[PDB]
Scaffold this active site. Structure first.
Site, PDB file in Angstrom:
ATOM      1  N   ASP A  44      26.538 103.491 -29.269  1.00 22.85           N
ATOM      2  CA  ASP A  44      26.127 103.070 -27.907  1.00 22.85           C
ATOM      3  C   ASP A  44      26.628 101.210 -27.946  1.00 22.85           C
ATOM      4  O   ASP A  44      26.168 100.297 -28.308  1.00 22.85           O
ATOM      5  CB  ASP A  44      24.830 102.966 -28.018  1.00 22.85           C
ATOM      6  CG  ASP A  44      24.295 102.529 -26.857  1.00 22.85           C
ATOM      7  OD1 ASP A  44      23.916 103.603 -26.077  1.00 22.85           O
ATOM      8  OD2 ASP A  44      22.973 101.604 -26.856  1.00 22.85           O
ATOM      9  N   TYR A  49      27.858  93.167 -23.690  1.00 23.95           N
ATOM     10  CA  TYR A  49      27.687  92.948 -24.959  1.00 23.95           C
ATOM     11  C   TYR A  49      28.645  92.473 -25.532  1.00 23.95           C
ATOM     12  O   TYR A  49      28.717  92.014 -26.623  1.00 23.95           O
ATOM     13  CB  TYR A  49      27.782  94.676 -26.257  1.00 23.95           C
ATOM     14  CG  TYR A  49      26.379  95.296 -25.735  1.00 23.95           C
ATOM     15  CD1 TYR A  49      25.593  95.097 -25.218  1.00 23.95           C
ATOM     16  CD2 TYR A  49      26.739  96.220 -26.336  1.00 23.95           C
ATOM     17  CE1 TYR A  49      24.379  95.665 -24.868  1.00 23.95           C
ATOM     18  CE2 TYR A  49      25.513  97.557 -26.173  1.00 23.95           C
ATOM     19  CZ  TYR A  49      24.653  97.309 -25.161  1.00 23.95           C
ATOM     20  OH  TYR A  49      23.282  97.889 -24.614  1.00 23.95           O
ATOM     21  N   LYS A  78      28.562 100.179 -20.805  1.00 23.83           N
ATOM     22  CA  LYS A  78      27.818 100.417 -19.854  1.00 23.83           C
ATOM     23  C   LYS A  78      28.641  99.543 -18.145  1.00 23.83           C
ATOM     24  O   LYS A  78      28.913  98.948 -18.903  1.00 23.83           O
ATOM     25  CB  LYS A  78      26.220  99.895 -19.638  1.00 23.83           C
ATOM     26  CG  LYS A  78      25.615 100.506 -21.324  1.00 23.83           C
ATOM     27  CD  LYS A  78      24.335 100.079 -21.589  1.00 23.83           C
ATOM     28  CE  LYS A  78      23.648 100.611 -22.825  1.00 23.83           C
ATOM     29  NZ  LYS A  78      24.302 101.011 -24.019  1.00 23.83           N
ATOM     30  N   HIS A 111      24.574 100.088 -15.923  1.00 27.98           N
ATOM     31  CA  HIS A 111      23.527  99.043 -16.689  1.00 27.98           C
ATOM     32  C   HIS A 111      22.448  98.996 -16.404  1.00 27.98           C
ATOM     33  O   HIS A 111      21.211  98.756 -16.792  1.00 27.98           O
ATOM     34  CB  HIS A 111      24.149  97.901 -17.320  1.00 27.98           C
ATOM     35  CG  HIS A 111      23.959  97.532 -18.206  1.00 27.98           C
ATOM     36  ND1 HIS A 111      24.083  96.830 -19.318  1.00 27.98           N
ATOM     37  CD2 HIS A 111      22.607  97.813 -18.770  1.00 27.98           C
ATOM     38  CE1 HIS A 111      24.064  96.204 -20.440  1.00 27.98           C
ATOM     39  NE2 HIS A 111      22.436  97.108 -20.329  1.00 27.98           N
ATOM     40  N   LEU A 259      21.536 102.145 -43.042  1.00 28.30           N
ATOM     41  CA  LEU A 259      22.281 102.919 -42.907  1.00 28.30           C
ATOM     42  C   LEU A 259      21.936 104.288 -42.776  1.00 28.30           C
ATOM     43  O   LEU A 259      21.624 105.112 -41.552  1.00 28.30           O
ATOM     44  CB  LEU A 259      23.737 102.915 -42.814  1.00 28.30           C
ATOM     45  CG  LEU A 259      24.811 101.790 -42.561  1.00 28.30           C
ATOM     46  CD1 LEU A 259      25.713 101.405 -42.674  1.00 28.30           C
ATOM     47  CD2 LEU A 259      24.479 100.644 -40.838  1.00 28.30           C
TER      48      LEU A 259
END
Lengths: 300, 299
Positions: A44, A49, A78, A111, A259
């Site tokens: 994602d 970012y 996004k 977004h 993880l």
């Protein structure tokens, strides 16, 4: 081990993904690579970012090495706020594809239902709240459907497999459903015990839209008690709380060791009573609110 | 005191609500309301008494008490009529019942689109969508319905247009595509559902707010403030809204309080009075489509 959710587009999407939000540019590559080794398949990401280039790096290494094929990886990105005007949507998508180094993304989301004035990539990237005029916010009169039609055309062009939206309230999602030819496949929203929005979730799921959740609840007695009840961690309870209701998750943690843990938590079931208990935590606390940016009425 | 709408037209800040005005007494009450000083009448196709409201207006006009241009008539486009091709159809029915050539304000009643139902089959349609008790919807985006309204304003059948029951993100998106910006936002508004952020956004975007509370008079806070200024709790609720620039529709106008509900601007609420009333906001919504068929307008 990771259950898949079939989107309305017909494509399968992993119910558990690796969040790239806040992944430091210097290690993002390594972290994504290791995540893929740890078995993660969905990533994602987002233009905002500022690390899509590095995320592409990790994916490329995994692929070059033969750990997976591109078609086994699900890439979500996004469209940021400055790129809502139809003529700029593709500009932003190309930037995302070239950073990620792929011919298409699996999922591209609007977004925010917010249109900042366009800012050239070479002027500032990612632009964030910058709208080409000092620290002032400047907007564009671009209705959501105009941006959506642009995305539908990019799906037809084969550059995006599935499209969706993030941070859309119910009335807005409803109206989009009325004008969309390719129904928004995903609704990504802030979702947790303090912001459950059960009516929004219900309406979206009944309309065929798949929900993806993003985002101390580890100290809360209700969560602690239910965790202790199943001999699970509080994090495991929070992820199963969503997973069990058919909601895809992007684990907030994922510290190297966590993880494998954050993706194999579906080993127990919460009961009706458990759900009613957790439902009492819902206080409507929204941490990600555009009202705080510039009194943008998205959630009022 | 009139409010100048973004459309340039003046709108009375105090109107007479036609919601739930019984058919048998609507004409007479609208008439007496005019003799009592009222000039704005807030009506709607869904109210089902538009024809009788028209009766009251005609009488007052025929008696030379007022002229058409002194009367401000509001109506609302019901949900089964959002499809562009059915918008003028519904407005025409509204104009014929009201016996006028135009309405001063026409609002999209709800951001909800029901399946069209012929006026000859059922009028007002209410929740009937042409399939027993089932709700059936049409894929008509708000903006398509809006453009249709904009055409009717250019045709001169509507003076001003606006919307009712629209949350923030929806009004914002409509403002992005509108040529004629919505001049009015009519929402449920009272001390328990204050929605200050929405109000603030709409007001700063130049949209005028009209409050209804159709669905406190005995509240400690309202009683005190009221008993403090020697007013009724109602005069206090109306003033509370009016002083913040919000238009209001008195919810009763009992023949006795007819005049009283249009003459409450004789005192001012203080910063403290507002702070005390602000404490009551608990986000309690009484008119929610979620209860009709889980329609996500406010979620």
């Amino acid at each position: 081990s990771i259950p898949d959710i079939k989107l309305s587009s017909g494509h399968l999407m992993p119910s558990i993904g690796f969040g790239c939000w806040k992944l430091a540019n210097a290690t993002a590559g390594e972290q994504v690579y290791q995540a893929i080794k740890a078995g993660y398949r969905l990533f994602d990401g987002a233009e905002d970012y500022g690390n899509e280039k590095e995320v592409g790096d990790g994916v490329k290494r995994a692929i070059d090495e033969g750990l997976v094929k591109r078609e086994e990886i699900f890439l979500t990105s996004k469209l940021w706020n400055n790129y809502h005007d139809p003529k700029n949507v593709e500009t932003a998508l190309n930037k995302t594809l070239a950073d990620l180094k792929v011919d298409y993304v699996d999922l591209f989301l609007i977004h925010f239902p917010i249109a900042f004035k366009f800012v050239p990539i070479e002027e500032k990237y990612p632009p964030g709240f910058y709208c080409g005029d000092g620290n002032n916010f400047v907007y564009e009169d671009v209705p959501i459907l105009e941006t959506w039609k642009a995305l539908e055309k990019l799906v037809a062009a084969g550059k995006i497999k599935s499209i969706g939206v993030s941070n859309f309230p119910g009335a807005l999602l409803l109206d989009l459903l009325r004008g969309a030819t390719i129904k928004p496949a995903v609704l990504q929203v802030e979702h947790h015990p303090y912001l459950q929005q059960p009516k929004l979730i219900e309406f979206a799921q009944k309309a065929g839209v798949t929900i993806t959740a993003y985002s101390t609840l580890f100290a809360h007695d209700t969560i602690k008690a239910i965790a202790a009840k199943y001999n699970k961690t509080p994090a495991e309870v929070l992820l199963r709380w969503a997973a069990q209701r058919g909601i895809a998750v992007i684990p907030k943690s994922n510290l190297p060791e966590r993880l494998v843990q954050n993706r194999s938590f579906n080993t127990f079931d919460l009961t009706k009573e458990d759900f009613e208990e957790i439902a009492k935590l819902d206080i409507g606390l929204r941490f990600n609110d555009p009202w705080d940016w510039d009194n943008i009425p998205i959630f009022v």
